[PDB]
Ligand binder design. Structure first.
Ligand code: HEM
Length: 390
């Protein structure tokens, strides 16, 4: 029957399957859920799908439609950012994730210094994921949300199930969802709560927002923490791994730290942290390249193939931190559903790389690359541990 998608959980190299997709930039695949989908792999056609309102994100959660994998979340939260905007909270949300809000940029530089010094004090080797990228990501999201740093562990423990890419519903996902919601409701009335959750609590009783239940405000906190932490931890872990795989680039940034912002664009382009496709349901019959896509069919945007399309990025496998169009990568999506937290994502990664170059310039892998354990059937490619020495 059909070519199975996805291809490999290994994040050390592009799956070999990508090369054969170049002759068939729209190809029918069988998904994890066992459903047909169109896998789109050229930069031009991926951009077209992301920018065209005939390709719906919201409709991928409708009942009975072809799926990539099973939902771990209630259906209505697939269009989270739209339910957020619709409810009048967009302003509060966009403020909390702005890296210029309440000294957030200064806090990230300061806290990254603390986490790396704690690692330096213990000596090598350490698991960089467990001891740096996890807490750096989780603590950022505790600060944004206004909840205690000490609660990061209970909320992060959910994400190993929440972002699974499973053929079947997961009983653990519903139990974790209900527990994290109940926790976030408790934070609304907690006198200690600050940040986004304190601003969301304050809207209650404001006549305009009588439609906003405690569960609905709690949904904003839970989904922001989950999406934000898995994305920042996933990307940053694999951006550092890419710098370990390209020591010449690590060395360019040691001598030229002013190039770090541009280097993060080029790492967004080549990193292999995305293990799935960006899903869209066709609202209408659309010709996409050579393929007549039918109304109600599932389309998957393959970011890692788009970002290495030589038509758009000549010499695509070269990591060039001076690449003029590095910024045109699809790793933050595009069109109506473009990541709203790109300023924070970039700044978070820039600062971590800056602090590691300054305080741990001899950073290297502590194990043979083949001894990494790649997480299977998960939305991200990540090594369970990233053992490093210096
Ligand atoms: C740091 C690296 C990050 C990466 C690589 C990343 C990547 C992405 C991508 C690819 C999408 C588009 C999904 C699609 O088109 O179907 C997206 C959307 C989104 N991201 Fe990010 N993201 C990052 C950080 C964050 C953070 C820190 C937050 C914090 C709250 C966040 C919240 C969201 C939300 C709510 C959406 C949905 C947008 C919508 O439906 O309009 N992201 N992200």
């Amino acid at each position: 029957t059909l070519l199975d998608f996805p291809f490999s959980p290994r994040g050390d190299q592009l799956p070999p399957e990508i090369e054969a997709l170049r002759a068939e930039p729209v190809k029918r695949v069988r998904t994890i859920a066992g459903d047909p989908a169109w896998l789109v792999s050229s930069y031009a056609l991926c951009k077209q799908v992301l920018e065209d309102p005939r390709f719906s994100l919201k409709d991928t959660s409708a009942p009975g439609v072809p799926r990539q994998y099973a939902l771990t979340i209630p259906p209505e939260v697939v269009n989270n950012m739209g339910n957020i905007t619709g409810a009048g909270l967009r302003k509060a949300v966009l403020k909390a994730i702005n890296p210029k809000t309440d000294g957030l940029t200064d806090w990230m530089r300061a806290h990254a210094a603390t986490l790396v010094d704690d690692i330096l004090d213990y000596g090598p080797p350490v698991d960089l994921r467990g001891r740096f990228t996890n807490p750096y990501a989780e603590h950022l999201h505790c600060r944004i949300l206004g909840i205690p740093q000490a609660d990061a562990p209970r909320l992060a423990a959910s994400l190993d199930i929440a972002f699974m890419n499973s053929a079947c519903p997961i009983t653990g996902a519903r139990l974790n969802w209900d527990r994290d919601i109940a926790y976030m409701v408790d934070r609304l009335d907690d006198p200690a709560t600050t940040g986004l959750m304190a601003e969301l609590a304050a809207l209650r009783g404001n006549p305009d927002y009588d439609h906003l239940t405690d569960e609905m405000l709690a949904t904003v906190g839970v989904t922001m923490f989950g999406a934000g932490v898995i994305s920042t931890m996933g990307f940053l872990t694999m951006a550092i791994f890419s710098l370990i795989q390209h020591p010449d680039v690590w060395e360019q940034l040691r001598k030229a730290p002013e190039k770090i912002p541009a280097a993060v664009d080029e790492l967004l382009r080549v990193n292999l942290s995305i293990a799935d496709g960006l899903p869209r349901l066709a609202l209408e019959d659309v010709r996409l390249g050579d393929v007549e896509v039918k109304k109600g069919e599932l389309v998957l945007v393959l970011v890692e193939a788009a970002n290495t399309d030589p038509a758009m990025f000549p010499d695509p496998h070269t990591v060039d931190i001076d690449r003029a169009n590095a910024g045109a990568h699809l790793s933050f999506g595009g069109g109506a559903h473009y990541c709203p937290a790109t300023a924070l994502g970039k700044k978070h990664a820039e600062i971590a790389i800056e602090v590691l170059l300054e305080r741990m310039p001899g950073l290297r892998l502590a194990v043979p690359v083949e001894q990494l354990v790649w997480r299977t059937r998960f939305m991200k490619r990540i090594p369970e541990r990233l053992p490093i020495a210096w």
